[PDB]
Design a binder for this molecule. Structure first.
Ligand SMILES: *[C@@H]1O[C@H](CO)[C@@H](O)[C@H](O)[C@H]1NC(C)=O
Ligand SMILES: *[C@@H]1O[C@H](CO)[C@@H](O)[C@H](O)[C@H]1NC(C)=O
Ligand SMILES: *[C@@H]1O[C@H](CO)[C@@H](O)[C@H](O)[C@H]1NC(C)=O
Ligand SMILES: *[C@@H]1O[C@H](CO)[C@@H](O)[C@H](O)[C@H]1NC(C)=O
Ligand SMILES: *[C@@H]1O[C@H](CO)[C@@H](O)[C@H](O)[C@H]1NC(C)=O
Ligand SMILES: *[C@@H]1O[C@H](CO)[C@@H](O)[C@H](O)[C@H]1NC(C)=O
Ligand SMILES: *[C@@H]1O[C@H](CO)[C@@H](O)[C@H](O)[C@H]1NC(C)=O
Ligand SMILES: *[C@@H]1O[C@H](CO)[C@@H](O)[C@H](O)[C@H]1NC(C)=O
Ligand SMILES: *[C@@H]1O[C@H](CO)[C@@H](O)[C@H](O)[C@H]1NC(C)=O
Ligand SMILES: *[C@@H]1O[C@H](CO)[C@@H](O)[C@H](O)[C@H]1NC(C)=O
Ligand SMILES: *[C@@H]1O[C@H](CO)[C@@H](O)[C@H](O)[C@H]1NC(C)=O
Ligand SMILES: *[C@@H]1O[C@H](CO)[C@@H](O)[C@H](O)[C@H]1NC(C)=O
Ligand code: NA
Ligand code: NA
Ligand SMILES: [Zn+2]
Ligand SMILES: [Zn+2]
Lengths: 369, 369
């Protein structure tokens, strides 16, 4: 009786879901399809006002790229069902001979930071970050391919006066309006190249740091790796950490190569008593390649991970939208549960055959009477 | 029935207590005192082999100063009952016109780091950290008064060749034998002075960073404050952060003033499933001045704080040792409890009149039948 249910749910109405197409009710189609057939989310929750979802997007995608959706929401119990819209299938690399594994590493670190903070905070949004630059050089879109263009962090071009990339550059940026900010601190870890016409011997070792003008704290990344830009020596891409920062006046200091600074930040507002987030596995139909980065990111004590036991098998829309088991997994949002724990959600508050671990809410005992 | 009990306890025998005189059974006295009267700990637990306690010491004290005890222990449920042996009563300052509030800030940050990590790790110990220095200058004991001498972090003297403190200095240190290390990264935030014979205009702005040679990550502190060493402008002391670092080859880089590097580290071994530590308020009889830094440090979800409702009132030993209510609070260690939660320990696993919050173990329901 009252076994842990493999669902995502809520203790009350104070909940919010962040998602993608599988939770996006505003999507339109002109065909002989059943109404809202792309959804894993139940159609009854479309008018709930507790969902931030966009077809073809994710939190990581909007945080880093020009394909931007203004994800925003507030809730005590935060649920995530997105992440698939930046996967190994997309195969993004900043450079022709880059590395997707680095970008999966970035995905894991971003979500880890986001999940941990959203266990301490009610509100999430994405705000624009402006910068003051004393030079004449303007932003350069270095990290991109033919599908995606990265715009966070922003990269500042070399000044016209400098012949090489052995220069020191800096810029100021203010973080205002939020209790905490998640910003990317990134670096090209390896041998970077200036212009395609430079000799084969001259390479640059990227260095970047962020500096708090008030507290004097600085966090930085120096280049250490051997990987590069050529076919003979490949691997160089953009490794990012995701820092939780207080509001204040910050300085971005680059000691070598391009100056990089945040253009976007995850705005964290309204602190709450510790309440772990719920994360639903976000993967393709196994014809496309997925990753378990969100699972790597989803750890105790800040996060509970939920997954089905089957391949993702779309019903009528396509192979990637409308899975029966994920529909049932998400169906838990239609009602309140008494206890949300590691194993799953316990519907009732009194007794169970299973002892709840890391339980939140009004949790049942597994004792006799 | 089965109300939360204001005690520290354990779910099984897999527990360890870190303490001071109030838990130190090896202490000796030649007088007409009752046996073991300085203890808050029950005498029956003296031979338990689950206590690391020393009369007149604490974790912070041993971590920073020459008054060192080799605190070591392993347990799933870690309990702390120490901290009073570095308090505002001691009034420690690195410099004559320093600031004790900075050192209380340091106390809060150290314990916060320690408590959070000891919720993820079974084993705690203090290991010596060695360094490689290419110069001739040897350690200088700059931070001290007439009671305490700081030896962590170690400070390296200025070289004989340098006329001033506007130099760049660096040293290597290896961290080996532990899964994670807690080390202090400290700085004199303000206007530092070289020799007492230097003019009134020449001051130095302390800068210190630690650098991972492999990953390229660096964490640093620059001086920003206006406080100094004189009577006219006082306040300058040593502000420390407490970093959790992986094993590896590290570089300590100082851009101005003295080079500082860790001599001691909290060695973290044997990762465990998340289990919050229990912390008992460590304060003097109200005749001496105490602090609530360990309470500031003890936060959800990694820590449960326990306090009595009375002044600390010693029975026979002195005013600072052997309190009835703390004895009863610690008496919970004599037996197992079913559930350890935020409000306290629930003895029984079945029913309660109170809903446990952040419960660990086999926790009771507050429902009817
Ligand atoms: C950045 O801030 C500093 C203050 O520390 C100021 O001196 C400098 O002019 C600022 N830079 C720009 C480009 O405004
Ligand atoms: C980091 O890189 C910069 C630029 O190459 C260099 O000047 C600096 O010494 C490096 N930092 C360390 C700690 O080696
Ligand atoms: C993720 O997948 C890798 C192999 O691809 C595996 O080693 C790892 O344990 C997985 N982690 C999680 C949290 O699923
Ligand atoms: C993908 O989805 C379809 C359902 O539309 C299912 O038949 C198939 O097993 C899934 N996996 C594949 C093709 O690998
Ligand atoms: C969940 O509980 C709240 C009050 O605690 C109530 O307003 C709401 O109707 C419940 N949710 C559903 C989906 O019925
Ligand atoms: C709960 O367990 C305790 C100890 O076994 C027992 O005294 C009590 O009768 C039990 N209460 C209920 C309602 O089962
Ligand atoms: C510190 O390590 C570096 C390697 O990065 C080495 O060049 C240097 O000689 C070392 N310093 C000392 C004093 O051994
Ligand atoms: C930190 O202090 C050093 C030494 O005074 C200085 O050279 C450096 O520019 C400072 N860093 C920043 C970011 O201002
Ligand atoms: C500690 O004491 C200060 C005042 O001395 C108070 O403002 C603060 O709330 C206290 N915090 C805790 C956790 O006891
Ligand atoms: C300190 O302890 C004694 C018990 O020995 C008690 O009488 C007193 O109330 C305590 N507090 C003081 C003196 O402020
Ligand atoms: C606590 O439980 C363990 C086994 O779970 C048992 O060995 C031990 O005797 C109990 N503790 C006490 C103090 O009786
Ligand atoms: C637990 O509560 C549920 C729902 O109210 C009820 O069906 C069941 O009888 C209760 N079980 C016990 C043992 O009280
Ligand atoms: Na750079
Ligand atoms: Na220094
Ligand atoms: Zn469709
Ligand atoms: Zn005595």
């Amino acid at each position: 009786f009252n076994e842990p249910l493999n669902i995502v749910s809520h203790l009350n109405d104070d909940w919010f879901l962040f998602g993608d197409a599988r939770s996006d009710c505003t999507y339109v189609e002109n065909n002989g399809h059943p109404k809202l057939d792309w959804l894993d989310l139940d159609p009854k929750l479309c008018n709930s006002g507790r969902i931030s979802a966009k077809s073809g997007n994710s939190l990581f995608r909007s945080f880093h790229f020009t394909d931007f959706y203004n994800y925003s929401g507030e809730g005590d119990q935060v649920i995530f069902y997105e992440g698939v819209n930046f996967s190994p299938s997309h195969g993004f690399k900043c450079l022709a001979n880059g590395d997707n594994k680095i970008w999966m590493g970035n995905k894991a670190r971003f979500y880890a930071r986001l999940y941990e903070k959203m266990a301490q905070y009610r509100s999430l949004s994405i705000v624009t970050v402006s910068y003051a630059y004393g030079g004449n050089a303007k932003p350069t879109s270095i990290c991109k391919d033919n599908k995606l263009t990265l715009n966070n962090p922003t990269f500042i071009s070399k000044e016209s006066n400098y012949a090489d990339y052995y220069y020191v550059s800096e810029a100021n940026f203010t973080l205002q309006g939020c209790d905490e900010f998640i910003v990317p601190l990134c670096v090209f870890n390896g041998h970077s190249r200036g212009s395609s016409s430079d000799p084969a011997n001259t390479y640059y070792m990227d260095s970047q740091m962020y500096y708090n003008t008030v507290t004097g704290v600085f966090y930085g990344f120096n280049s250490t790796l051997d990987v590069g830009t050529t076919v003979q020596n490949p691997g160089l891409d953009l490794t990012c950490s995701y820092l939780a920062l207080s509001p204040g006046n910050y300085k971005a200091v680059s000691l070598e190569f391009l100056l990089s600074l945040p253009s976007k930040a995850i705005c964290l507002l309204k602190p709450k008593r510790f309440m772990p987030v719920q994360v639903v596995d976000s993967r393709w139909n196994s014809t496309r390649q997925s990753d378990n980065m969100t699972a790597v990111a989803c750890q105790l004590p800040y996060c509970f991970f939920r997954n089905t036991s089957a391949d993702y098998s779309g019903d009528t829309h396509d192979v990637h939208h409308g899975d029966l088991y994920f529909r049932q997994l998400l169906s838990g949002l239609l009602y309140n549960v008494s206890c949300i724990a590691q194993q799953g959600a316990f519907l009732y508050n009194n007794v169970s055959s299973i002892w709840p671990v890391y339980g939140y809410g009004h949790c049942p005992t597994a004792a006799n009477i």
